[PDB]
Amino acid sequence: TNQLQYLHKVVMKALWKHQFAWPFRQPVDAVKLGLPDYHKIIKQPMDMGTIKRRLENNYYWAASECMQDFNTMFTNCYIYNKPTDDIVLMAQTLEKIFLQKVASMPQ
Amino acid sequence: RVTNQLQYLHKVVMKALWKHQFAWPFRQPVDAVKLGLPDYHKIIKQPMDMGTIKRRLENNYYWAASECMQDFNTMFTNCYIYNKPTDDIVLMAQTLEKIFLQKVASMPQ
Numbered sequence: 001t002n003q004l005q006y007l008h009k010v011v012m013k014a015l016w017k018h019q020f021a022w023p024f025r026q027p028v029d030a031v032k033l034g035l036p037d038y039h040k041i042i043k044q045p046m047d048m049g050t051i052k053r054r055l056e057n058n059y060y061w062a063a064s065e066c067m068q069d070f071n072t073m074f075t076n077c078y079i080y081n082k083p084t085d086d087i088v089l090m091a092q093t094l095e096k097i098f099l100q101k102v103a104s105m106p107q
Numbered sequence: 108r109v110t111n112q113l114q115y116l117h118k119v120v121m122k123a124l125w126k127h128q129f130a131w132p133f134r135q136p137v138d139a140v141k142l143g144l145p146d147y148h149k150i151i152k153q154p155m156d157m158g159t160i161k162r163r164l165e166n167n168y169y170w171a172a173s174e175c176m177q178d179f180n181t182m183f184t185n186c187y188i189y190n191k192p193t194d195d196i197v198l199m200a201q202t203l204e205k206i207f208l209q210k211v212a213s214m215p216q
């Protein structure tokens with residue numbers, strides 16, 4: 001659909017190449033990153049690589065379901081990490097852009 | 108006068124969230140003394156709540172939709188950052204934020 005195309009072509013593109021986006025481009029690998037408690041706390045892992053691939057395979061039926069995936073990703077970061085971690089600031093900056101771009105989604 | 112987006116945020120988004128059965132912990136600013144959380148303002152530097160947003164929507168404080176959207180987001184993000192992952196209020200915020208998101212997916216302009 002139209003909104004899904006916008007979420008792919010405008011929203012995701014602007015988030016993907018942002019200088020803070022690299023921690024969010026691929027699933028958290030808790031082994032490599034030394035986070036053995038990650039999957040005990042985050043029961044619904046999400047990342048922009050998963051969302052992008054889903055957008056490119058007609059996984060989503062509605063824009064709502066893609067935006068919910070974006071929100072889960074960010075919320076996972078706020079929930080798991082300490083308030084003072086830089087990745088909290090990185091997620092907030094990206095989430096602001098997502099909300100701005102979403103406010104301009106076609107209807 | 109009021110833009111279509113702020114009409115929508117007020118008439119659709121704030122209407123749904125204010126009357127919601129999980130809304131009540133978010134209707135007024137966190138009172139750290141009444142709630143007994145003496146670190147709250149040490150961790151949370153920009154407090155947000157639905158009462159403030161509701162008032163800002165009534166008194167045309169916002170210049171753009173994304174500005175009201177940001178306040179909603181800050182309110183929810185404060186909750187996820189400050190509280191423990193297992194606190195019930197986190198899942199109350201998640202339920203309200205999912206509605207917020209669903210509604211803004213049909214915002215005009």
Ligand SMILES: Cn1cnc2c1c(=O)[nH]c(=O)n2C
Binds near residue numbers: 024035
């Ligand atoms: C999404 N992501 C990617 N890398 C990380 C995270 C995270 O949430 N916490 C965290 O500590 N690290 C290293």
Ligand SMILES: Cn1cnc2c1c(=O)[nH]c(=O)n2C
Binds near residue numbers: 131
């Ligand atoms: C403190 N407390 C505990 N439960 C509640 C409240 C309240 O203030 N409003 C309210 O609606 N509910 C259910």
Ligand SMILES: Cn1cnc2c1c(=O)[nH]c(=O)n2C
Binds near residue numbers: 132133137142196
């Ligand atoms: C927004 N709000 C309202 N009441 C609370 C909170 C909170 O963030 N944590 C928290 O623990 N409590 C009790």
